[PDB]
């Protein structure tokens, strides 16, 4: 069994009294729901309030979310309930604190006394012309416009980040990683970090654009989009590695499928369209996150049908990741907690067998491990396909579950 939970949103840093201290009070609810891992925001000092433009990686106390004591305390309370902690690891880029003879901010400070992480421009991918001095290696991945991209091919970088990472685990208590902007560097570079710190897991945000049409909807076939995510996992180490990836394929598809087009939820081979259908054990599914959802809403889920969203991911193969806002702010707490119960109640896991039974434009029915059957759509009747011995269980707007 394994169920992740994103424990923040784009507005969390603003929490009065501190976000970690407020989370302290949500530990029981979260654990009693069935959650197994909680994803927490970048804990370090950041030029940006949300934590995504890290500067002094060791300076945990400069964090808008809370200091080391409140964080360690939040983590400990999580461990007390058997719930693991996942840190949002942001290393594709980093900001410099001091300028150099050129007047360019490119001399970094780790946040300690000694020289750790006190890099200079030699540590910036040379093709990031804006900050480098041209001595470094070429960026192994995509660039981040607003900050210096770190040259992960440099020996001291790899050794010093691996050090920082291990420290997060030992001193703070973090169990696993969430690799921010993983398309920012090579899967071979992520492998170095994942292998060098051996985390319970490491889900990477590898987010590329989906193939769309003239009208602006995703195409039915999303194999190239999911093949890229699968290839990342393969290059990262495949099954031998703790690496995994967010199912943006499923997120993208589902986002349009619940719009009266549930025929999208099944591919030609009859398997699940997203990464779920080809490598569920490596797929972390989700409805929304701090980017897609929240106050950033770059790709929000049809507001009006979020539960079908959870109906889907909470009952299907692949690793479900519940979003803080939906579990506390929207009011699906009980509905969602139930679905998880049903999931656990049957031992349904990432690799569970999926047998779809209906892909009508307005109705999707599928049987998982033959023990559970779910349904999302405006169609009021599909009993015709519900096997024998199943009794209506959880249910709500445009969705219903069955068990036998
Ligand atoms: Ca220093
Ligand atoms: Ca950059
Ligand atoms: Ca990069």
Curated annotation (Swiss-Prot):
Protein's cellular compartments: Secreted, Extracellular space
Result after altering residue 279 to A: Over 10-fold decrease in affinity for starch granules. Abolishes binding of starch granules and reduces activity towards starch granules by 99%
Effect of residue 205 to Q: Loss of activity
Family matches, as InterPro entries: A-amylase_bs_C, A-amylase_pln, Alpha_amylase, Glyco_hydro_13_cat_dom, Glyco_hydro_b, Glycoside_hydrolase_SF
Binding residues annotated for Ca(2+) 1, in chain numbering: 92, 139, 142, 149, 184
Main location: secreted
Activity regulation statement: Redox-insensitive.
UniProt keyword annotations, A-Z: Calcium, Carbohydrate metabolism, Germination, Glycosidase, Hydrolase, Metal-binding, Secreted, Signal
Catalytic function, reaction form: Endohydrolysis of (1->4)-alpha-D-glucosidic linkages in polysaccharides containing three or more (1->4)-alpha-linked D-glucose units
GO BP term (any one): starch catabolic process
Cofactor: Ca(2+)
Keyword Calcium: yes
Sequence similarity: Belongs to the glycosyl hydrolase 13 family.
UniProt name for this protein: Alpha-amylase type A isozyme
Native source species: Hordeum vulgare (Barley)
